Amino acid sequence: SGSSEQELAAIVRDLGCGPYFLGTHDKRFPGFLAGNKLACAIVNTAGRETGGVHWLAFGWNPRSRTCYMFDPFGFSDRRLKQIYSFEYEAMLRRSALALSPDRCLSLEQSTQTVQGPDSAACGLFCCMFLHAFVHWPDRPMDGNPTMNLLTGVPNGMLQSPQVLPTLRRNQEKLYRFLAHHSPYFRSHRAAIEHATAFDKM
């Protein structure tokens, strides 16, 4: 269900993120541990042994010492822990102690969903966010050419029938964005769209 590790890696590299990309990880992604280059990762909420559950993106901007955590659903940390049994405080601590002279960092995260509740497109939305991040690392969540294509909806409305048109339109815009930007996606488009469909789940 949803995108494989290799699909995500191929697409993120089509999107120009290869130099920065630490790889597709399970929930044990260790963090941002050395040097001063822009960095990013795609991280599952679950361990590899489970077969995977949900995809998140992380970005690290060394200039500002800002870590971005992008959940396509925009869940809070408390809700990621409750729903997905996923916590990432240890990774942030590790990263701050490795990279920041004052043992601090800034954490920016979404409060809104771009994705329908039954969609299997989370990893693809993560790739789209990472394109925004590597091209506009000081303002990836909104107010850039990539994320301006999507409409965020309050996370608390995720299960409402009133938002389904908006969330489906986001998915259609995601696929058109990927078709413009990714030869991998173009070559496998029908299959990937089936596998990641809005009502898949």
């Binding site: 800002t66 601590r93 701050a96 102690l97 043992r103 601090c104 800034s106 920016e108 409060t111 909104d142």
Partner: peptide, 10 residues
């Protein structure tokens, strides 16, 4: 998306 940015110190 709307977002929140918080400072975390360790």
């Amino acid at each position: 998306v709307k977002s929140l940015k918080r400072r975390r110190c360790y």
